[PDB]
Write an enzyme that holds these catalytic residues in place. Structure first.
Site, PDB file in Angstrom:
ATOM      1  N   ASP A   1      -5.954   8.705  -0.749  1.00  0.00           N
ATOM      2  CA  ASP A   1      -5.550   7.699   0.233  1.00  0.00           C
ATOM      3  C   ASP A   1      -4.304   8.096   1.056  1.00  0.00           C
ATOM      4  O   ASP A   1      -3.329   8.686   0.565  1.00  0.00           O
ATOM      5  CB  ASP A   1      -5.275   6.440  -0.471  1.00  0.00           C
ATOM      6  CG  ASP A   1      -6.427   5.915  -1.288  1.00  0.00           C
ATOM      7  OD1 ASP A   1      -7.599   6.154  -1.017  1.00  0.00           O
ATOM      8  OD2 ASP A   1      -6.118   5.223  -2.242  1.00  0.00           O
TER       9      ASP A   1
ATOM     10  N   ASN B   1      -8.737   5.784   2.780  1.00  0.00           N
ATOM     11  CA  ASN B   1      -9.452   6.695   1.885  1.00  0.00           C
ATOM     12  C   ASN B   1     -10.346   7.779   2.519  1.00  0.00           C
ATOM     13  O   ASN B   1     -11.187   7.553   3.397  1.00  0.00           O
ATOM     14  CB  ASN B   1     -10.240   5.785   0.938  1.00  0.00           C
ATOM     15  CG  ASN B   1     -11.003   6.504  -0.157  1.00  0.00           C
ATOM     16  OD1 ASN B   1     -12.154   6.857  -0.036  1.00  0.00           O
ATOM     17  ND2 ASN B   1     -10.502   6.802  -1.310  1.00  0.00           N
TER      18      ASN B   1
ATOM     19  N   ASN C   1      -6.976   9.532  -5.964  1.00  0.00           N
ATOM     20  CA  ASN C   1      -7.826   8.683  -6.803  1.00  0.00           C
ATOM     21  C   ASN C   1      -8.537   9.444  -7.922  1.00  0.00           C
ATOM     22  O   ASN C   1      -8.680  10.672  -7.891  1.00  0.00           O
ATOM     23  CB  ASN C   1      -8.884   7.966  -5.919  1.00  0.00           C
ATOM     24  CG  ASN C   1      -8.299   7.228  -4.712  1.00  0.00           C
ATOM     25  OD1 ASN C   1      -8.719   7.368  -3.575  1.00  0.00           O
ATOM     26  ND2 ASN C   1      -7.300   6.410  -4.790  1.00  0.00           N
TER      27      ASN C   1
ATOM     28  N   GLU D   1       0.806  -1.221   0.000  1.00  0.00           N
ATOM     29  CA  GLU D   1       0.000   0.000   0.000  1.00  0.00           C
ATOM     30  C   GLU D   1       0.848   1.283   0.000  1.00  0.00           C
ATOM     31  O   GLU D   1       0.614   2.213  -0.766  1.00  0.00           O
ATOM     32  CB  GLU D   1      -0.957   0.049   1.232  1.00  0.00           C
ATOM     33  CG  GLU D   1      -2.274  -0.790   1.157  1.00  0.00           C
ATOM     34  CD  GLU D   1      -3.246  -0.551  -0.019  1.00  0.00           C
ATOM     35  OE1 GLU D   1      -3.148   0.456  -0.716  1.00  0.00           O
ATOM     36  OE2 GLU D   1      -4.103  -1.389  -0.283  1.00  0.00           O
TER      37      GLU D   1
ATOM     38  N   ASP E   1     -16.074  -3.892   8.592  1.00  0.00           N
ATOM     39  CA  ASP E   1     -17.146  -3.366   7.751  1.00  0.00           C
ATOM     40  C   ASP E   1     -17.935  -4.377   6.896  1.00  0.00           C
ATOM     41  O   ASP E   1     -18.779  -3.987   6.073  1.00  0.00           O
ATOM     42  CB  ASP E   1     -16.499  -2.279   6.869  1.00  0.00           C
ATOM     43  CG  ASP E   1     -17.432  -1.253   6.240  1.00  0.00           C
ATOM     44  OD1 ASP E   1     -18.286  -0.715   6.951  1.00  0.00           O
ATOM     45  OD2 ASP E   1     -17.307  -0.986   5.035  1.00  0.00           O
TER      46      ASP E   1
ATOM     47  N   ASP F   1     -11.812   9.490  -8.607  1.00  0.00           N
ATOM     48  CA  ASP F   1     -13.011  10.154  -8.128  1.00  0.00           C
ATOM     49  C   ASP F   1     -12.782  11.438  -7.310  1.00  0.00           C
ATOM     50  O   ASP F   1     -13.732  11.972  -6.732  1.00  0.00           O
ATOM     51  CB  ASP F   1     -13.830   9.185  -7.264  1.00  0.00           C
ATOM     52  CG  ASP F   1     -13.188   8.747  -5.948  1.00  0.00           C
ATOM     53  OD1 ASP F   1     -12.097   9.140  -5.578  1.00  0.00           O
ATOM     54  OD2 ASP F   1     -13.772   7.947  -5.260  1.00  0.00           O
TER      55      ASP F   1
ATOM     56  N   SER G   1     -11.171  11.625  -4.280  1.00  0.00           N
ATOM     57  CA  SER G   1     -10.636  11.311  -2.960  1.00  0.00           C
ATOM     58  C   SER G   1      -9.131  11.030  -2.917  1.00  0.00           C
ATOM     59  O   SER G   1      -8.447  10.848  -3.918  1.00  0.00           O
ATOM     60  CB  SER G   1     -11.348  10.113  -2.363  1.00  0.00           C
ATOM     61  OG  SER G   1     -11.068   8.918  -3.066  1.00  0.00           O
TER      62      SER G   1
END
Length: 129
Positions: free
Chosen positions: A52, A59, A46, A35, A101, A48, A50
């Site tokens: 990280d 995120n 990203n 990562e 989650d 969209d 956003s």
């Protein structure tokens, strides 16, 4: 801070992650490796809008507030910059919420493409834990 492999393994165990929701250490260290390459300051934007953040690339659309992701939910209740600290506490406490989650470690795309179903035991192999 750029962590050494066994240095991060010991910090993650210390913070309760070995076998957290059934995931051995080895999975978490392999996840941080791919990562962020064990660097607490890594950030990636990203498509969209956003971003990280940190060691585990958490995120900003769902998990933290960075003030520039419209519609974001801030579920870990934290500024995304807390995630870039050399103390991994906030990153580990947010990751605990993300693995819980419903989809486990599949939330981290590099864990499922590079770590999932591999010998993740090799990532903690020479370490004093």
């Amino acid at each position: 801070k750029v962590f050494g492999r066994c240095e991060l393994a010991a910090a993650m165990k210390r913070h309760g992650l070995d076998n957290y929701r059934g995931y051995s250490l080895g999975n978490w260290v392999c996840a941080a490796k791919f990562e962020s390459n064990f660097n607490t300051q890594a950030t990636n934007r990203n498509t969209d809008g956003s971003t990280d953040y940190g060691i585990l690339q958490i995120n900003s659309r769902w998990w933290c507030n960075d003030g520039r992701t419209p519609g974001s939910r801030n579920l870990c209740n934290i500024p995304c910059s807390a995630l870039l600290s050399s103390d991994i506490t906030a990153s580990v406490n947010c990751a605990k919420k993300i693995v819980s989650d419903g989809n486990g470690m599949n939330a981290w795309v590099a864990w499922r493409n590079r770590c999932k179903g591999t010998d993740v035991q090799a990532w903690i192999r020479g370490c004093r834990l």
